[PDB]
Amino acid sequence: RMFKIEAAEIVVARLPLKTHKVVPLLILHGEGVQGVAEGTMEARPMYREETIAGALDLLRGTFLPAILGQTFANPEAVSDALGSYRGNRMARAMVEMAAWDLWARTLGVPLCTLLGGHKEQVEVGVSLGIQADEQATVDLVRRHVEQGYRRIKLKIKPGWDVQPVRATREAFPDIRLTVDANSAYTLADAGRLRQLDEYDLTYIEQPLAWDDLVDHAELARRIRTPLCLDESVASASDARKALALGAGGVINLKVARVGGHAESRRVHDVAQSFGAPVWCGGMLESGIGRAHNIHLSCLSNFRLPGDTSSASRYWERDLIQEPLEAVDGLMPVPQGPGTGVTLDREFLATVTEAQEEHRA
Amino acid sequence: RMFKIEAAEIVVARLPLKTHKVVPLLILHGEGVQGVAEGTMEARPMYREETIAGALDLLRGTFLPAILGQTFANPEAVSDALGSYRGNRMARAMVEMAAWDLWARTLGVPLCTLLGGHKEQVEVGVSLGIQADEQATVDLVRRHVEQGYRRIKLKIKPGWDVQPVRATREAFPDIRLTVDANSAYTLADAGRLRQLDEYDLTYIEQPLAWDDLVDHAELARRIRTPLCLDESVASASDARKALALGAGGVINLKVARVGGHAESRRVHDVAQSFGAPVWCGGMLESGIGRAHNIHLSCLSNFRLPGDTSSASRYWERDLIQEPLEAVDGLMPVPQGPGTGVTLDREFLATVTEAQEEHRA
Amino acid sequence: RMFKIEAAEIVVARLPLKTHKVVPLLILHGEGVQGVAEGTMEARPMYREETIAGALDLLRGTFLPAILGQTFANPEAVSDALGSYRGNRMARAMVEMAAWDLWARTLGVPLCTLLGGHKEQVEVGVSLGIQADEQATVDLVRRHVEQGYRRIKLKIKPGWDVQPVRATREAFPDIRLTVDANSAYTLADAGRLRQLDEYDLTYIEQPLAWDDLVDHAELARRIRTPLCLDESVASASDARKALALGAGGVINLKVARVGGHAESRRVHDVAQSFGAPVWCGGMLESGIGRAHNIHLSCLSNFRLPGDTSSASRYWERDLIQEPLEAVDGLMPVPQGPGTGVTLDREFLATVTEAQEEHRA
Amino acid sequence: RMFKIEAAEIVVARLPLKTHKVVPLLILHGEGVQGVAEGTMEARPMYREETIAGALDLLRGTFLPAILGQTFANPEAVSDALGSYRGNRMARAMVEMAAWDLWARTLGVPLCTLLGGHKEQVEVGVSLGIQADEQATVDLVRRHVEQGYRRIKLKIKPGWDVQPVRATREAFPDIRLTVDANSAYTLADAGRLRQLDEYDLTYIEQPLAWDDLVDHAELARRIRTPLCLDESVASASDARKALALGAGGVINLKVARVGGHAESRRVHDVAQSFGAPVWCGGMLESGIGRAHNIHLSCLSNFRLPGDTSSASRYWERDLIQEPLEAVDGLMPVPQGPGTGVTLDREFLATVTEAQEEHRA
């Protein structure tokens, strides 16, 4: 039956990178279990428009007051209760995704199962930076290919795009290879980007403006490599407009970017209805965010490998007790109810920089 | 955790109307509970292409042997186990919808809750057949408006379309009025159908061929009244195609026609991503199908009234213990786990034409 | 003059493959001659949506009662008498095509002649499976090329498509070569499929969903190889919409898939009106179905070789008395009235698993 | 079996109207029967481009030597034997339609039966010339409505179009009303022609240039009244092009204009695949041409009334023994093999201007 949200903690961790990454956590308490989610907004608006200060104020001043002491049938009812505030989808996601974890746990059921997924493991790839040169690139890719990662994603810019790709492609003609064009291009770069077509990349990710669809649709007409959208799809309706416009053929689905799991399933199903795959993006998450990602990636239209690589790549120590490690490019689903992962409270305390509790 | 399907019954009933209607039921047994669904295919292929003989042969010879004795995480995993076969969506829906009911009952959770709904009541419309004249049409509309229905549907046909709509709108300037054109028209009829535009109908349902989207798209360019698709939307990709082509702006969503609740929710979500409403169609269901319809209708993009009106309107006595009776145009969600309704087995046995049981 | 259908037999044969293939036969009796047709639906819905159980029930319960004891001018009048039932085109075809055979026989005229054809032989090719590897492929193709088959059709999938084709094409740069992409692809595969363009395949057959036209039209814009449609054209109007959309440039015309000979001529003439050829598909038919195919293939827009290869390739013994063998990729038209072939009744009796007779 | 064409007569008659009309006839002899067809080209190129001198030279110098002494399976094989020559469709139709008549008579089967028709009567419309004023127009329409015609066609011209249509529709709110715009308009006339829209005409026939589709397509975008094509549809591919371009939604089908019955049935079937009706146009034919028209009009997509009204309206005395007289808007199919009508040779001889006979 229904669940009452009795309390909420906001806990902000500073996790040293194997300097540091800020991990905002929401813990929701109810019915003798807890749901935990991780914010993917940054202290500064560099990847997208939200910030930690903005989001946390929104949580404590608006979203939490709306739900505390209230009883709900499902996470959809929680989302409905937040109201018609505009944007701020990652802030919303913290509440929505914590509610999914909590709801799943009241039932004793794995999160993926309630979302409609039935995989026991998900395929994963890796994303690498710009290397010094053609050889360095080929060597560092080789390192990850020898780990069995199922897709290699290279950062590119002008004019370091064709070189890395041509090099990597000759060394490895059979690997699945893609680029993150990092919005470093404008329509004026179409001809250069077209030079990548010979190398059979699965896609070129977000080459133009982070908020654009119209120019991407134009660029897609000029080159043969499929475009993948990331930043410009923050909702199921964005996904619809992008795919109808022909702005891309692939979507990088980031769960919090679109406002949480239910909206993510809708994005996933819209892409599928257009015959376009999705794959799971990464935001350098702690094991909380990483576990939410893995559960969502169990859905059938996650047909390309996600950026969901081994936790030990990122952290000398994670915030959860369970390891999240891929082998041979396959990441298993963490077992247990909800996310199947558990905060390591003692370790978390050592890296906490802010903490607060809220009740009705 | 997971559920094992131990056994299945197919019960074919011949249920007396308020002549008789053949009602095929599938009961799935496992984990100490049962899931029940109702087939919407007829003896002859009149509404669509499937028949009772084809469907039941497909169940007992193919679908049931594929699932009996098997253990599943969720209804999506059940459907997956049948994925190789083409078409036959209503046969498929019998298994898939029974699986939803069973699964929900293993958790003790209402079906609407697991599909993402949080409504306690759903809005209902009424459907009027062709009457003798204008005033007989108006008198019948007057009755149903007074009973509180939230939408009026008029059957129309060539030679009888503008007249009943004109007479109705003149008597009722502000009601929600729709028509069912029952694939009775051609493109030559565009000028006649345009004559409906001044009467501000919410939609005209499937005026052209039952399996067409392309000609509907053309008709929608020639008249201003919205088109609503029925038979030609049998999947989420069909929904995407119809909306993207501009074949209509509204979908009559029938859960069994599209293959069950999971795909129905995908259709619902695709439509929503286009900003287009769905509503719940009816197939003269016994209490089993009617209760599945009510649970599905709880989803948020069911924003026009559905054909889930009172069971007493159809049946002397229904196959379930619970009355499903709308009051003032509102149908309550039957309370309880899964569909929240319960077969009356003794009454059922009195109207059973044929029954059979299958195990692994 | 007119013909009265006095009786109908349904005879179901189990024919061992050179395990077994089920051959449903309809025999219609009238005016001292008989017409015979073969159902191409399967026991399970694997190629398309109909099944033997569904179709036979439709024949005995609906189509046969409609025609028995009735007198008709032509096969068109027989089809008209079946009524407005939806879909089930292969069930309809059994009646329609048997009526063509019967009608032709009352006149003493070859079926092809009444359909408007005037060829004495038809060009044929072959369709092969996936081979172990590039060499096996090339060798097995060589076997058929040395028999003079006029087109070689390879099964493909990802990622075994470019390899077979490149191999076969180098060994044989001049042969007519095509692939059956077997609906094993989605729009996400456009780039790979494009790699086939260099090898000058005549067409790629039904790469996307069996029931789709819209995505095929999109894929056609992205690759240079023509698309051929099979499953998604079940009528002359489907053919029109497909060709107007640009969903393909070639149609695989299967006579029973579209509902029989008259509809097939209409499909053939619509394709011709758009400047698109057709060719005759195959459904592993006995000599009954094979002979109907050959007669239909005499029409002038059958401009590409059909899958109508030698009977002795399939059966150690056929159900008819006459051989149907191609030499040098040319299949002669069986002489005589109607189909020009004759059931071997004694042999048929040995492989009959069901038989029934129906009268007015 | 096959037919040998042994001999041909060309008879040119000058038939007195109820002044005179020149009627060119071709008679084909073989297998103890004869086939007769009537030329629809005039002495001067006024309706279309062909003339009696051109056509008859083409017959006696080219077409007849190609077929005399040759043996054919069907009329399609006869047409094929002339395939090298360009245009001249009405000359071609003389041979092709005579071949249909001959062939049908070798089998003892009515022509309509072999073309696929099963109607015993066809619906007929009437064509009114330009009258002096509104009331003279209305009085004449009143007469023809009372005689039972199923469609009224008004000739219109610039300066006289809206007025007669307005007056007619006011007097007759519900009749099927059409106009013949006789290529008398230009695109500058779009606003005037749009003024016809409120009068719900079934179609406006060929308002712009006789050989155009493109400008008609443009006009159809500017007004809501359907356009009907006549002179610019001379083949099935012209039909496909017109319908796909949206040049019109209806085709006036004249059997001789398109090259005969086989191509006419292809035009009919193409139109049908687009969901567009055809109707049978008239060319003031003697009983020979009128009877071919009636047999063709039996096909199912002749869903609007045809100009095959009573022969007595045109001729003091017709060239055939049988009266073709419509009653209450219905023309019976003349009974008998082929066209079911028979030349009155003694009467014919009295009005014969010139005759000739050819053998191999």
Side-chain angles (χ1 to χ4, degrees), chain D residues 183 185-190 193 206-223 225 227-229 232 241-242 245-248:
Chain D
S183 304
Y185 292 84
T186 67
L187 288 163
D189 296 312
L193 291 173
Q206 201 84 207
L208 309 180
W210 72 270
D211 58 340
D212 163 275
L213 294 172
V214 159
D215 289 341
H216 288 272
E218 175 62 20
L219 170 70
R221 289 173 195 112
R222 302 201 199 148
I223 76 178
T225 303
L227 306 186
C228 171
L229 292 322
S232 57
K241 284 163 199 196
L245 287 168

Side-chain angles (χ1 to χ4, degrees), chain B residues 130 155-164 180-186 189 192-193 207:
Chain B
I130 291 188
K155 188 154 159 188
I156 60 160
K157 72 177 173 187
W160 194 245
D161 38 40
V162 178
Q163 314 97 116
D180 181 356
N182 184 214
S183 304
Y185 292 84
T186 67
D189 296 312
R192 182 64 174 188
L193 291 173

